[PDB]
Amino acid sequence: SVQIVYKPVDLSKVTSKCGSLGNIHHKPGGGQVEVKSEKLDFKDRVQSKIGSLDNITHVPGGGNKKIETHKLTFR
Amino acid sequence: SVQIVYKPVDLSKVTSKCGSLGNIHHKPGGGQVEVKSEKLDFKDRVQSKIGSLDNITHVPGGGNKKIETHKLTFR
Amino acid sequence: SVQIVYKPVDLSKVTSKCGSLGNIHHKPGGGQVEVKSEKLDFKDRVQSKIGSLDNITHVPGGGNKKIETHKLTFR
Amino acid sequence: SVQIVYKPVDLSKVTSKCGSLGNIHHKPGGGQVEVKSEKLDFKDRVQSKIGSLDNITHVPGGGNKKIETHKLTFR
Amino acid sequence: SVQIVYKPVDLSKVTSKCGSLGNIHHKPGGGQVEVKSEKLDFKDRVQSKIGSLDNITHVPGGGNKKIETHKLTFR
Amino acid sequence: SVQIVYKPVDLSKVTSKCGSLGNIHHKPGGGQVEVKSEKLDFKDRVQSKIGSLDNITHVPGGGNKKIETHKLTFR
Amino acid sequence: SVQIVYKPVDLSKVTSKCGSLGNIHHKPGGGQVEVKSEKLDFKDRVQSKIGSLDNITHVPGGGNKKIETHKLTFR
Amino acid sequence: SVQIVYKPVDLSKVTSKCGSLGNIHHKPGGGQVEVKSEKLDFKDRVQSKIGSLDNITHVPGGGNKKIETHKLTFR
Amino acid sequence: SVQIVYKPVDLSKVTSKCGSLGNIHHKPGGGQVEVKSEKLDFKDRVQSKIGSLDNITHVPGGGNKKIETHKLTFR
Amino acid sequence: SVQIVYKPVDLSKVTSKCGSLGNIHHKPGGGQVEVKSEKLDFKDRVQSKIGSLDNITHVPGGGNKKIETHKLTFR
């Protein structure tokens, strides 16, 4: 027989502090993209970006990414 | 028989502090991209970017990435 | 029989502090990229970037990367 | 029978401090890249970058990378 | 029978301090890259960069890399 | 007694012939221009261009310039 | 007694012939220009261009310039 | 008694022939220009270009310049 | 008694022939130029270029320059 | 009694022939130029180029220069 016990306890404190951020300036001068093709054939979990100019400004006022996985397989 | 015990306890404190960040300036002059092809064929978990100019400004006001995995296989 | 005991306890303190960061300037003059091909065929966990000019400014106001893995296989 | 005991306890303090960073200037003049090919065929965990000019400014306001792995195989 | 005991305790203090960093200037004049080929065939954990000019400025405001592995195989 | 005879007689043929010109393509990317000053004091036939991106295409279907000056003094 | 006879007689043929020109391609990338000053004082026939990116394509379908000056003194 | 006879007679043929020119490609990358000064004082026929990136394509379908000066003194 | 006869008679043929020119490719990379000064004082026929990247392509379909000066004194 | 006869008679043929020129390729890389000064004082026919990267391609489809000066004194 099997006695399987899983009981992790993960405690954490994650902190970010800032007085002020500041005058952030993002001022790009755009260019150009040219794409030439004939045929595309795709499938089954595919992600794609063809031909783009995406200017992104991301200024979270402090932040955190916390990722946790608990994965069990019993065969 | 099996007695399997899993009980990790991971405690942590992660800290980031800053008075102020400052006047961050991002000012690119864009260029050009040219892509020439005929056929594309793709599948099964593929990620792609073809032909792009993505100017990204990312200024989190301090931050953390905390990644944890607990993976068990019992055959 | 087996008596398997796993109980790590990892405690840590990770700290980053700064008064102010400063006036960071990022001002690239863009160039050009030309890619010529005929056929692409790809699959099964592939990541690719073809033809790009990505100017990235990343200024986290201090930060940390903490990665932990607990992996067990019992055959 | 087996008595297997795993109980590491790793304690640490990792610190980075700075008064101010300063006026960091990144000002590249872009060039050019030309790639000519006919066919590509690839698969199974492949990462690639073909034809790029990625200017990256990374100024974390102090930081740390802490990586830990606990891996056990019981056959 | 086996009595296997693993209980390392590694304590450490890692510190980096600086008053100010200074006015760091990175100002490259770009060149050119030309790559000519016909066919590529690749697979199974391969990483590659073909044809690139990546100018990178990295100024962490002090920092540390701490890597630890605990690996056990019981046959 | 002053006798002045001015009688240039200048006959000419200026010719330009052409079957066809062709598919002219002009496709410039962008860029950035920044100018700072305090005071401008301009007097008496002052011509200037300050701060500009003027991209032009000029395709005359053949052309010629013929310029003549006939200037006489009488003192 | 002064007798002046001015009678140049200049006959000419200026010719340009062409079947076709061709597919001219002009595709420049970008760039960045920055100029700083305080005071400008310009007087009496001053011509200038300050701070610019002027990309031009000039494709006349053949052309010629014929310039003549006929200048006489009388003192 | 002064007798002056000015009678140049200059006959000429200036010719340019061409089947076709060809597929001319002009594809420059970018760059960066930075200029700093305080005071400019320009007087009496001053011509200047300060701080610029002027990329040009000039493809006349054949051409010629014919310049003549006929200048006479009378003192 | 002064008798002056000026009668040059100059006949000429200037010829340029060509089947075709060819596929001329001009593809320069970038670069960086930096200039610092305080005061400029320019007077009386001053011509200058300060701080520039001028890349040009000049492909006349054949051409010629014919220049003549006929200058006479009368003192 | 002064008798002056000026009658040069100069006949000429200047010829350039060509089947085709060829595929001329000009592909320079970049570089960096830096100039520092304080005061410039320019007077009376001053021509200058300060701080520049001028890359040019000049491919005339054959060409010639014919220059003549006919200058006479009368004192």
Indicate the resolution in Å.
3.3
Within 48-67 of I, beta carbons closer than 8 Å to E belong to none
Nearest CA among H59, I67, H9, I58 for reference residue G67: I67
Residue D53 DSSP SS3: coil
* C21 close to D61: Cβ distance less than 8 angstroms: yes
CA-CA distance, I28 to D30, in Å (whole number)?
11
Distance from CA of J55 to the nearest CA of E (A): 14
CA-CA distance, F44 to H45, in Å (whole number)?
11
DSSP annotation of J8 reads -
CA-CA distance, J73 to D40, in Å (whole number)?
77
CA-CA distance, B29 to A32, in Å (whole number)?
11
- B27 to chain G: closest CA residue: G32
**Three state DSSP letters for chain H:** CEEEEECCCCCEEEEECCCECCCCEECCCCCEEEEECCEEEEECCEEEEEEECCCEEECCCCEEEEEEEEEECCC
Nearest CA among A60, F35, E57 for reference residue C55: E57
* C44 close to B42: Cβ distance less than 8 angstroms: no
| Whether J30 and E27 lie within 8 Å, measured CB to CB | no
- Residue by residue, DSSP assigns chain E as -EEEEE-----EEEEEEEEE----EE--B--EEEEE-SEEEEESSEEEEEEE---EEE--SSEEEEEEEEEEEE-
| Whether C32 and F29 lie within 8 Å, measured CB to CB | yes
The structure tokens listed for F25 are 């393509």
CA-CA distance, C53 to F66, in Å (whole number)?
48
Which of B32, B33, B53 should be substituted to probe chain G, the one whose Cβ sees the most G Cβ atoms within 10 Å? B32
CA-CA distance, D14 to D24, in Å (whole number)?
25
* F67 close to H65: Cβ distance less than 8 angstroms: no
Distance from CA of G4 to the nearest CA of I (A): 10
**Which residues are within 8 A (CB) of E57 and not within 5 positions of it... i.e. 6 or more apart?**
D24, D26, D56, D57, D58, D59, E24, E26
Q: Compute φ and ψ for F54, nearest 5 degrees.
A: -105, 100
* F29 close to A32: Cβ distance less than 8 angstroms: yes
CA-CA distance, C72 to G19, in Å (whole number)?
78
CA-CA distance, B71 to C68, in Å (whole number)?
11
DSSP element (H, E) containing B63 = strand B63-74
Strand ranges of the sheet holding C39-43, from the earlier edge strand across to the other edge: A39-43, B39-43, C39-43, D39-43, E39-43
Strand ranges of the sheet holding J46-52, from the earlier edge strand across to the other edge: F46-52, G46-52, H46-52, I46-52, J46-52
Pairing of strands E2-6, D2-6: parallel
- Residue pointed to by tokens 């009981």: A7
| Whether G68 and F63 lie within 8 Å, measured CB to CB | no
CA-CA distance, E66 to D10, in Å (whole number)?
12
Chains E and F make contact, 3+ CB pairs within 8 Å = no
Strand ranges of the sheet holding J39-43, from the earlier edge strand across to the other edge: F39-43, G39-43, H39-43, I39-43, J39-43
Q: Compute φ and ψ for E24, nearest 5 degrees.
A: -80, 130
- Residue pointed to by tokens 């099997």: A2
D62 vs B contacts (CB less than 8 Å) = 16
Phi-psi region for residue J14, left (φ > 0), alpha (ψ -120 to 50) or beta? beta
Please report, in angstroms and rounded to a whole number, the separation of the first and last CA atoms in chain I. Answer: 14
Distance from CA of J60 to the nearest CA of E (A): 27
- D32 to chain I: closest CA residue: I29
- G31 to chain A: closest CA residue: A29
Q: Compute φ and ψ for G52, nearest 5 degrees.
A: -150, 160
CA-CA distance, G46 to F47, in Å (whole number)?
6
The structure tokens listed for F45 are 């036939």
- Residue pointed to by tokens 């790809």: C42
Nearest CA among I43, G40, H45, H32 for reference residue F50: G40
* I53 close to H31: Cβ distance less than 8 angstroms: yes
Chain centre to alpha carbon of residue B68: 14
CA-CA distance, I20 to G17, in Å (whole number)?
13
Which of I40, I47, I62 comes nearest H41 by C-beta? I40
Nearest CA among J64, J58, J60, I61 for reference residue H61: I61
- A33 to chain G: closest CA residue: G29
Nearest CA among A34, F24, I33 for reference residue H23: F24
Pairing of strands C46-52, D56-58: unpaired
CA-CA distance, C14 to D64, in Å (whole number)?
7
Phi-psi region for residue G13, left (φ > 0), alpha (ψ -120 to 50) or beta? beta
CA-CA distance, G44 to E4, in Å (whole number)?
96
What technique was this entry resolved by?
cryo-EM
CA-CA distance, I40 to I42, in Å (whole number)?
6
The structure tokens listed for E45 are 């954990």
Phi-psi region for residue A69, left (φ > 0), alpha (ψ -120 to 50) or beta? beta
Which chains contact F through at least 3 pairs of Cβ atoms less than 8 Å apart? A, B, C, G, H
Which chains contact G through at least 3 pairs of Cβ atoms less than 8 Å apart? A, B, C, D, F, H, I
**CB-based contact, H30 to chain D, within 8 Å:** yes
Nearest CA among D6, F70, G67 for reference residue H64: G67
Which of I18, I27, I38 comes nearest J62 by C-beta? I18
Size of interface C-G (CB pairs under 8 A): 11
| Whether H29 and C32 lie within 8 Å, measured CB to CB | yes
Chains J and I make contact, 3+ CB pairs within 8 Å = yes
* B43 close to A42: Cβ distance less than 8 angstroms: yes
Phi-psi region for residue C62, left (φ > 0), alpha (ψ -120 to 50) or beta? left
CA angle D41, D43, D45 (to 5 degrees): 145
* H53 close to H15: Cβ distance less than 8 angstroms: no
Residue B53 DSSP SS3: coil
CA-CA distance, B19 to C18, in Å (whole number)?
7
Which of A29, A30, A32 comes nearest F27 by C-beta? A32
- H43 to chain I: closest CA residue: I43
**Which residues are within 8 A (CB) of H42 and not within 5 positions of it... i.e. 6 or more apart?**
G40, G41, G42, G43, G46, G48, H48, I40, I42, I43, I46
* I64 close to H16: Cβ distance less than 8 angstroms: yes
Size of interface G-I (CB pairs under 8 A): 10
| Whether D27 and I32 lie within 8 Å, measured CB to CB | yes
Pairing of strands E56-58, F56-58: unpaired
**CB-based contact, G31 to chain B, within 8 Å:** yes
CA-CA distance, I66 to J69, in Å (whole number)?
11
Pairing of strands E32-36, H46-52: unpaired
**CB-based contact, C5 to chain A, within 8 Å:** no
Nearest CA among E34, H4, E13 for reference residue D10: E13
Strand ranges of the sheet holding H63-72, from the earlier edge strand across to the other edge: F63-72, G63-72, H63-72, I63-72, J63-72
J61 vs H contacts (CB less than 8 Å) = 16, 18, 21, 62
**Three state DSSP letters for C13-61:** EEEEEEEECCCCEECCECCEEEEECCEEEEECCEEEEEEECCCEEECCC
The structure tokens listed for H70 are 């006929």
* B38 close to A7: Cβ distance less than 8 angstroms: no
The structure tokens listed for C12 are 């840590």
Q: In this structure, how many other beta carbons lie within 10 angstroms of the beta carbon of residue J49?
A: 12
The structure tokens listed for C22 are 């400063």
* H40 close to G37: Cβ distance less than 8 angstroms: yes
Residue A55 DSSP SS3: coil
Strand ranges of the sheet holding A25-26, from the earlier edge strand across to the other edge: A25-26, B25-26, C25-26, D25-26, E25-26
CA distances from G3 to D62, F10, H71, I8, I75 (A): 93, 22, 17, 20, 15
Chain centre to alpha carbon of residue I16: 19
| Whether I61 and G31 lie within 8 Å, measured CB to CB | no
| Whether H61 and F18 lie within 8 Å, measured CB to CB | yes
Cα radius of gyration (chain F)? 24
CA distances from E11 to B34, B68, C10, C16 (A): 54, 21, 10, 19
Q: Compute φ and ψ for E30, nearest 5 degrees.
A: -65, 155
**CB-based contact, F31 to chain B, within 8 Å:** yes
**CB-based contact, G31 to chain A, within 8 Å:** no
Cα radius of gyration (chain I)? 24
| Whether C31 and H27 lie within 8 Å, measured CB to CB | no
Nearest CA among C29, C31, C49, C32 for reference residue C40: C49
CA-CA distance, C23 to C32, in Å (whole number)?
28
